[PDB]
Amino acid sequence: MVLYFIGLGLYDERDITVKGLEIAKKCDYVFAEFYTSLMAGTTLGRIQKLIGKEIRVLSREDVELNFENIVLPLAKENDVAFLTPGDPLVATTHAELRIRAKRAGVESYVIHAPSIYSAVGITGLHIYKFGKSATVAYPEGNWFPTSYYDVIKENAERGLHTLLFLDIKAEKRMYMTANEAMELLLKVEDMKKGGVFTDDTLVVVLARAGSLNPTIRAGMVKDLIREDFGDPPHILIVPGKLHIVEAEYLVEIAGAPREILRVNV
Amino acid sequence: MVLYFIGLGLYDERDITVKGLEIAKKCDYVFAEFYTSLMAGTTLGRIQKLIGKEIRVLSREDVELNFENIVLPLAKENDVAFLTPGDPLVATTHAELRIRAKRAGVESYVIHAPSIYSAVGITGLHIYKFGKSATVAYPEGNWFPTSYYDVIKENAERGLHTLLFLDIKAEKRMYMTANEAMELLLKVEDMKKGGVFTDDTLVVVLARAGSLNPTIRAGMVKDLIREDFGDPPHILIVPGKLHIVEAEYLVEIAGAPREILRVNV
Ligand SMILES: Nc1ncnc2c1ncn2[C@@H]1O[C@H](CSCC[C@H](N)C(=O)O)[C@@H](O)[C@H]1O
Ligand SMILES: [Pt+2]
Ligand SMILES: [Pt+2]
Ligand SMILES: [Pt+2]
Ligand SMILES: [Pt+2]
Ligand SMILES: [Pt+2]
Numbered sequence: 001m002v003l004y005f006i007g008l009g010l011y012d013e014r015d016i017t018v019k020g021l022e023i024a025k026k027c028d029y030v031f032a033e034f035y036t037s038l039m040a041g042t043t044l045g046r047i048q049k050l051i052g053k054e055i056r057v058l059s060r061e062d063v064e065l066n067f068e069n070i071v072l073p074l075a076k077e078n079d080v081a082f083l084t085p086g087d088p089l090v091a092t093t094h095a096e097l098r099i100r101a102k103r104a105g106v107e108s109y110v111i112h113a114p115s116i117y118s119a120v121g122i123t124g125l126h127i128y129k130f131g132k133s134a135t136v137a138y139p140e141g142n143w144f145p146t147s148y149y150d151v152i153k154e155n156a157e158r159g160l161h162t163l164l165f166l167d168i169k170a171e172k173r174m175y176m177t178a179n180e181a182m183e184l185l186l187k188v189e190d191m192k193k194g195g196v197f198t199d200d201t202l203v204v205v206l207a208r209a210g211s212l213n214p215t216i217r218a219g220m221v222k223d224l225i226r227e228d229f230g231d232p233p234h235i236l237i238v239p240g241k242l243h244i245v246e247a248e249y250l251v252e253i254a255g256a257p258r259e260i261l262r263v264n265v
Numbered sequence: 266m267v268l269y270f271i272g273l274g275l276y277d278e279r280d281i282t283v284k285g286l287e288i289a290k291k292c293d294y295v296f297a298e299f300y301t302s303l304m305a306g307t308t309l310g311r312i313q314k315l316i317g318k319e320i321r322v323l324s325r326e327d328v329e330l331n332f333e334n335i336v337l338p339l340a341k342e343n344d345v346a347f348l349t350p351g352d353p354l355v356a357t358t359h360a361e362l363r364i365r366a367k368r369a370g371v372e373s374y375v376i377h378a379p380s381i382y383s384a385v386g387i388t389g390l391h392i393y394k395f396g397k398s399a400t401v402a403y404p405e406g407n408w409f410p411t412s413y414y415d416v417i418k419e420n421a422e423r424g425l426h427t428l429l430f431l432d433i434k435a436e437k438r439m440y441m442t443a444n445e446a447m448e449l450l451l452k453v454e455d456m457k458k459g460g461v462f463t464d465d466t467l468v469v470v471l472a473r474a475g476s477l478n479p480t481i482r483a484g485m486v487k488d489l490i491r492e493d494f495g496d497p498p499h500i501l502i503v504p505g506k507l508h509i510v511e512a513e514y515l516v517e518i519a520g521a522p523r524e525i526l527r528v529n530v
Binding site: 113 | 278
């Protein structure tokens with residue numbers, strides 16, 4: 001008589017925790033959503049196969065409007081699981097869904113999974129040095145979001161790193177690339193001139209974490225902005241002040257210029 | 266031919282990903298360390314039974330001083346696995362090990378798993394609002410660290426949440442508790458009088474993340490400082506100004522005082 005929030009992990013269907021896989025198997029109903037992120041290494045088919053259940057996929061509307069009409073009821077009698085890419089509660093508004101469940105008399109449990117928020121550790125940057133985070137959103141119409149630019153600025157002054165989730169348009173099937181994100185920030189630099197993001201700023205790009213051969217590249221915008229990083233999902237990082245060892249990792253593992261090694265202490 | 270960095274997850278043996286188990290089982294040699302953190306929900310015996318291989322445990326010294334002599338050699342002619350709690354490379358000194366693997370001419374691949382960094386999402390706080398992270402260290406000798414206090418100050422100032430790791434004596438098997446951590450912050454407040462951590466400060470305590478029954482509690486320090494949060498590990502969080510939705514989750518889920526709806530929002 002419970003409902004389960006089970007993460008699916010970063011890349012393919014095997015990125016799920018054993019615990020999550022065994023609970024999903026003994027589940028009466030299985031729902032899922034694939035609009036919060038992109039699992040570029042699998043297919044609903046491979047997932048259903050690994051689970052041994054038919055998975056009913058929900059849209060953002062079904063969830064943000066009819067979660068308690070579509071899913072909660074079934075959990076007032078059976079054992080239902082809600083699957084999501086990566087960690088179900090990270091950089092999503094799903095947490096509020098738990099209150100819905102509560103208010104509906106349904107117990108909820110969270111089975112975590114590998115998230116991009118911690119996967120950044122593979123870039124060589126210290127996870128504790130990351131400051132506030134932000135999302136580079138696609139401008140739409142005459143509306144041009146810029147808040148993320150200020151986030152990058154704030155952290156930079158404190159010497160902290162910035163994690164930038166790139167935008168996604170699941171239904172339109174649009175997945176922002178690091179390049180597009182780099183382009184937008186340049187145009188925001190022009191508008192604001194805070195000297196926060198420029199052709200020289202060092203950036204880090206992580207593509208397809210969770211795959212066994214992800215793309216990890218570091219360098220100055222001008223040198224990376226026109227580079228092919230492979231298929232999405234992509235994630236962008238604007239480092240703050242580096243530690244020698246962070247720099248060494250970036251050069252030896254991310255192909256950055258042996259010059260960034262000279263940290264301007 | 267390769268060396269695999271595999272995360273074991275947060276609490277028990279089922280917290281490892283499916284991909285991680287398959288890879289580990291097919292490996293020739295399997296190493297693991299348990300000094301960065303401990304899996305309170307399990308034992309080395311259950312981990313060994315699950316993988317079905319003899320696991321050699323390495324000391325902090327073993328890794329930091331002789332990783333290239335104990336682990337890397339075997340990866341020249343075999344497929345070796347290095348197990349670590351959480352997500353690989355989230356521990357500061359861990360990323361550097363990949364640089365060694367390369368120089369020894371060894372190819373390395375990272376297999377992620379849930380980390381505490383992403384798992385705190387279960388507190389209801391928004392991930393993007395987390396600032397710099399810090400660790401509350403036990404004073405000892407003529408050494409009384411207080412930097413973690415400033416981290417909280419600079420974060421709260423900018424409306425950001427502070428994730429606070431508690432000190433662990435991994436060999437002695439002794440966990441710092443949320444309570445002990447609160448005591449320390451009170452003594453530090455009483456010394457720097459910056460009005461950062463007082464009896465009235467709202468804090469969140471997370472214990473045993475990763476289990477189906479973790480302890481999530483929120484309230485004023487004066488009301489939690491002597492509450493029983495169960496067995497370690499404990500994580501302490503000093504949230505910045507709350508988003509109403511956050512406040513609602515902490516109340517409805519973490520059983521927090523209604524006060525926060527008017528007070529901390
Ligand atoms: N495996 C992966 N590799 C690279 N980027 C990833 C990724 N998974 C998610 N991202 C990035 O994260 C943003 C989507 S936000 C969704 C995050 C997801 N809920 C989680 O917890 O992991 C996009 O920028 C997407 O590219
Ligand atoms: Pt039931
Ligand atoms: Pt497109
Ligand atoms: Pt430069
Ligand atoms: Pt091989
Ligand atoms: Pt103790």
